[PDB]
Amino acid sequence: IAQVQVQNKLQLATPLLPQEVQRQGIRVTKAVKNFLMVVGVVSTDGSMTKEDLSNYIVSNIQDPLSRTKGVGDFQVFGSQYSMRIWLDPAKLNSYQLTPGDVSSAIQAQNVQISSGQLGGLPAVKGQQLNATIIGKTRLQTAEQFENILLKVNPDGSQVRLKDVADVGLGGQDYSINAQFNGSPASGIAIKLATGANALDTAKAIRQTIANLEPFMPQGMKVVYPYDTTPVVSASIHEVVKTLGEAILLVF
Amino acid sequence: MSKFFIDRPIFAWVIALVIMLAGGLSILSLPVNQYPAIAPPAIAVQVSYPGASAETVQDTVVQVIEQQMNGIDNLRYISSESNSDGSMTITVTFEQGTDPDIAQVQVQNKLQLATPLLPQEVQRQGIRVTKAVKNFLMVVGVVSTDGSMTKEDLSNYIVSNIQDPLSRTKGVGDFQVFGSQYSMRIWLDPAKLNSYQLTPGDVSSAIQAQNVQISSGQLGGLPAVKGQQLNATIIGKTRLQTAEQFENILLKVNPDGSQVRLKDVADVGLGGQDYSINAQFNGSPASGIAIKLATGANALDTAKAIRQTIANLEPFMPQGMKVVYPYDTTPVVSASIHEVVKTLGEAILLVFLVMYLFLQNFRATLIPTIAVPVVLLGTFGVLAAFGFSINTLTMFGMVLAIGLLVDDAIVVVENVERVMAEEGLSPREAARKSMGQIQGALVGIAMVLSAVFLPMAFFGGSTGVIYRQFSITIVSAMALSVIVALILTPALCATMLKPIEKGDHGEHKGGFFGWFNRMFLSTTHGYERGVASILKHRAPYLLIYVVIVAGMIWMFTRIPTAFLPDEDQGVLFAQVQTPPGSSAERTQVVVDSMREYLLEKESSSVSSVFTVTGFNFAGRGQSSGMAFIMLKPWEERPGGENSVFELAKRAQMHFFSFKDAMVFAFAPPSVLELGNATGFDLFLQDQAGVGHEVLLQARNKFLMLAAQNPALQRVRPNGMSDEPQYKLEIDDEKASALGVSLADINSTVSIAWGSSYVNDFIDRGRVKRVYLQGRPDARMNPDDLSKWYVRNDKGEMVPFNAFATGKWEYGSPKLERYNGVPAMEILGEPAPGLSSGDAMAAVEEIVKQLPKGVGYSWTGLSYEERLSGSQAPALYALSLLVVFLCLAALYESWSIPFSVMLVVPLGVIGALLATSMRGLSNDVFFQVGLLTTIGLSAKNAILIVEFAKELHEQGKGIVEAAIEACRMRLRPIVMTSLAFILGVVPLAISTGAGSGSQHAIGTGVIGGMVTATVLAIFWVPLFYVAVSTL
Amino acid sequence: ASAETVQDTVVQVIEQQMNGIDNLRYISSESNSDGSMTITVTFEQGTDPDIAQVQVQNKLQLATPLLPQEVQRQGIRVTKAVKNFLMVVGVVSTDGSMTK
Amino acid sequence: GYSWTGLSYEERLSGSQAPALYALSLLVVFLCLAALYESWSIPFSVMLVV
Helix, strand or coil: CHHHHHHHHHHCCCCCCCHHHHCCCCCCCCEEEEEEEEEEEEECCCCCCHHHHHHHHHHHHCCCCCCCCCEEEEEEECCCEEEEEECCHHHHHCCCCCHHHHHHHHHHCCCCCCCCCCCCCCCCCCCCCCCCCECCCCCCCHHHHCCCEEEECCCCCEEEHHHHCEEEEEECCCCCCCEECCEEEEEEEEEEECCCCCHHHHHHHHHHHHHCHHHCCCCECCEEEEECHHHHHHHHHHHHHHHHHHHHHHC | CCCCCCCCHHHHHHHHHHHHHHHHHHHCCCCECCCCCCCCCEEEEEECCCCCCCCHHHHHHHHHHHCCCCCCCCEEECECCEECCCCEEEEEEECCCCCHHHHHHHHHHHHHCCCCCCCHHHHCCCCEEEEECCCEEEEEEEECCCCCCCHHHHHHHHHHHCHHHHHCCCCEEEEEECCCCCEECEEECHHHHHHCCCCHHHHHHHHHHCCCCCCCCCCCCCCCCCCCCCCCCCCCCCCCCCCCCCCCCEEEECCCCCEEECCCCEECCEECCCCCCEEEECCEEEEEEEEEECCCCECHHHHHHHHHHHHHHHHHCCCCCCEEEEEECCHHHHHHHHHHHHHHHHHHHHHHHHHHHHCCCCHHHHCHHHHHHHHHHHHHHHHHCCCCCECCHHHHHHHHHHHHHHHHHHHHHHHHHHHHHHHCCCHHHHHHHHHHHHHHHHHHHHHHHHHHHHHHHCCCCHHHHHHHHHHHHHHHHHHHHHHHHHCCHHHHHCCCCCCCCCCCCCCCCCHHHHHHHHHHHHHHHHHHHHHHHHHHCCHHHHHHHHHHHHHHHHHHCCCCECCCCCCCCCEEECCEECCCCCCHHHHHHHHHHHHHHHHHCCCCCEEEEEEEECCCCCCCCCCEEEEEEEECCCCCCCCCCCCHHHHHHHHHHHHCCCCCCCCCCECCCCCCCCCCCCCEEEECCCCCCCCHHHHHHHHHHHHHHHCCCCCEEEEEECCCCCECCEEEEECHHHHHHHCCCHHHHHHHHHHCCCCCCCCEEEECCEEEECCEEECCCCCCCHHHHHHCEEECCCCCEEEHHHCEEEEECCECCEEEEECCEEECEEEEEECCCCCHHHHHHHHHCHHHHCCCCCCCEEECCHHHHHHCCCCHHHHHHHHHHHHHHHHHHHHCCCCCCHHHHCCCHHHHHHHHHHHHHCCCCECHHHHHHHHHHHHHHHHHHHHHHHHHHHHHHCCCCHHHHHHHHHHHCHHHHHHHHHHHHHHHHHHHCCCCCCHHHHHHHHHHHHHHHHHHHHHHHHHHHHHHHHHHCC | CCHHHHHHHHHHHHHHHCCCCCCEEECCCCECCCCCECCCCEECCCCCHHHHHHHHCCCCHHHCCCCCHHHHCCCCCCCCCCCCCCCCCCCCCCCCCCCC | CCCCCCHHHHHHHHHHHHHHHHHHHHHHHHHHHHHHCCCCCHHHHHHCCC
16 A cells, blocks of 8 residues: 555656656565575676676566565666667768767667558458558667668768667666676676565575576576575574474473 | 253343344345356456557567566466557456455556556557456347447447446446447548648648647736736637537648648548447347446346336437347346245255154244254354355355254254153253253264365365355354254253153054054164164175275276366357458358358247457457357256257357358356366467567477377467568668658558547547548558658658568467467367366476477466365365364264264265266365265264264163164154255256256265265164274 | 536546445535546545555546546546644744745 | 535434434343343333333
């Protein structure tokens, strides 16, 4: 009920936020203050850099580890890929262009639009053809992405995004990037959901990562650099064995 | 506890009156519906993003929503659906026990945290979040007989002026209508757009420039100038109402006065909103309402209120419009509670009859007719105390409970009358002696019956709820029957009985009753020497007992296991699939021919066909359709000639000859909430290997080996086969080299072919919306792309074939996901006569060949059935341990409870034999009938072994007392037995509403109880002497 | 906007969708020439107000696809409302120099 | 048509609710005095001295 109340008092205010923070995804979670455990991933062949095995956890490990029982909020050390368009003002002066023109071209030339149907309804009486018509799909690879047009004169001379900027896939924020035991690594810091225990949540996290284990590439382990469940399990076991020896001493 | 009230009866009588008064107050405030909340609470999210591809709506809506919901409570699994028609459906399925309101508001909140990331064309549609629980009370269907009104006119008429009185009535919850209201549909044409140098971007700008509210202020608004005396709420422009106000909006005008209206550019006129769906009822075009029931509300008087609302609205409808009721689960509930009231009356009158038949007096015969309705009314009160509702399940639990519910009062009045007969005491002290002899026995009945039914309540899932209803109802019946037979019945046996003197049984009476007394003591003192002969040498009879225990083991191993019995529900589903690349009229030619076959030659069974195209349980679009054919009631089709499970075969043997489309007919399950499968469900999701073609080859390999195994049968894909779809390739350098802007091309191809939501208008005081497309003869051909014109920057028209070449592709029209990765769903059925776990093992064996990167995940009912398969051989052994504890408590040893817990095999043997002879399955109804006949066998076994112990405590041997106790206690067994099968047999011999449930719940009970009596009354003192020689 | 267009735009739709909640007694509404509206749905006594607010803004959400775009941009404020004023706390200027 | 609200609906509920209160409490006193003293004379005495 507390999350629902702060959520409607947040949706009362979220259109008054700026336009670019509104397109980032606002998160409201029931997270307690401590880090429960950190599911870490380190590569053992050296072919994986920091950003690629952060991309792997964000794209494949994060969401099954986020639907599970008792995980409120994550904290991913790194992030996924996001293909960046590295402008430079020398070649941006070379063709008399502003970055607003580039930002309008890369909003007008990779869109996935409502196209309709080739035999859509209502049909003229006596029409027996149907096909889902396809407009432009969104651009996937970088060599397909370099062919974004920016300006072209009617005599046939054009400029491309490959001539203005140097495109390439990389992270979306290079601020945080961990490293485990010397090697390049990353991980996802898991916070516990409130009103729930820690051992069942940790066991569900272990079962989820063990279900996702047979699909990761070769040269990529899963390690646990930080967890607070073995201390509490050892404390419970120590008090149970203290009880089991105290009953024998009373006997 | 009973000796304290047998002296003073008025206090016990007003305790019973308080119980009956609380029950009578609870009767008029119980909610009542067909099925309780047994489905897992699933939440649907439906978007109607118009004119999209099958992967456009997916990669712009579904992944954006599914990667932003993170950390909702009690989440089990989520799904998706990205149809080619443009819709979307994700079904967030939660854990049991979660009330749907907070789960729905949490998925609402974590959806509206994601809705700014969704595109503008999606977030102007509005993202609807409703509860997906398929329990429809009644389906109000509106038709138009003459054919002058299409479906969208009927849907506007519904949403206009029959939705206003319907939702203001009591008890009606949330509901949906087929289709929606009108929309000012604006039909552009490309020749007139060429003729004026126009583009649909200019029309879409001028409409939303001349059809908006303008926030004008006030004439004298604050702050006022010093000396202001005037105030008037000024208003500016207003939303346009009619179509002759959209005809007079202007697109451009020169300063000479030469203008261009929306006339001679467009053809405005009110039409529908979603043209894809199209339903028709017996020929006439039809819309409808699907009314659900709100929580905590009666179904009968609210259905009558819906009937009364329609019957009070009917003098105002247009001519040619009937309101029909195709689907209505009001008479199912009504007949299912009416048969319970009839069998209550039959049970009390029939136990009155057998109580007068075996005992000669009338006053002692009258007392079950008082002592049974008090616990009958009070169990509704202490059923309302837990927050339940009158279901079908708890009413059949009541009917299971009646025959044992009467037995406590029967054995009380029998013991009082036989203590009256044998020694001749005054009634209060004779009933005092009887109650002092049944003191521990009645609380032993309470503890043993609670121990044998309460662990059955502790399952988890839909299985857990459908056992929990049964268990809590009959445990409430036990725990209230024991106290109303320990507290009430001796207090009235001390008052309203007739004394009998010493050594008399009524031998010189004459007539029929003297003959009955003579034959009854004749078979009694023949039974004396019979049990003496079978107990005098008892060695070759325990061998027969262990042979018949091998009989129950190798008789229960044989029969197959079922989840729910097959039911005559009343409906049949007939979903069709035309070959890919088919329009709507081919599907309609299949559908109306199927409809006229099911009405013309099948007038004996099918009452009406509410059929529909563009929709099935497989996947939406234009090349699909169904026929919700709905049978006649049970009182108009006698015999087994017109059942649903024969009408399906008689329809399918002709639907094999409809050679246009694969017409498929399947019966719904017992419960429609978790239904539509009758088997197992599986998603073949991919975790690592990326590619739609690889997963399509995986499903092809899986369907190749699925039809080869004999353990699998009728294995179909739930998705859709691939449609041949048409693509464009807009040559962007040749487009922008001619001079057109690519945003103008995107707006033209997004407004001309597919629709585009602009803004809202106001008609009849109601906000409706405005779409626009091209004409229904301006987008219908691949060569008709050469007719639309984008605008160059010089002011001249550029044709669309100058820079766009066509090419045909082959893609999927329905891409669905499962927990964030794409998948394809099957709908599997087990082999006829094989268990469901055997089919699950034989279908998880096939997954050992799929390519590297394609996983499997269970769903539907199999996710509960796989995880719930580890408690049933745990808590049954727990319940046997608890009943061993209770019988060690009552009988002061550790070996004498074996003389009771070796008797319930003799109760399960007859039930297994009676449900193996007439061909039934091992469903939940036979299992709870098995449990209640086990409970009745333990019920009379502990009383006969307790008198066998008591007569040995009197001071005689084992052999004399074991045949003394059965001699003294034969007649309550034949009272219980004769009244029991006379009360239960009219369930099995009859039919009607819920025939399969009654046949599954009656014949195992009578076959178990008759065999339990005829073996227990001969073998229980043999077990007692065999355990007492140790 | 004026009162009748606010009524027939917003209030009729949410009035149509906010009946059928359990333990409901009467729903009533207002509109103004200023433009504001106030639906004041009143439950039967015996209901937890938290789950009542949960159900109210649960079945409020499927009116948003019917309401226009000048009201979706501002957000709907739901709250539990008693009718008494418990306390009015107000400042006052003893200098006489500063205005309202 | 007219429909009461605010204070008026609550006091109309009181007016339609009071005789059930009188009859049900009178019957509960009747049941308790038939309960504890176990006669059918003195509960009629209290029910016609009320």
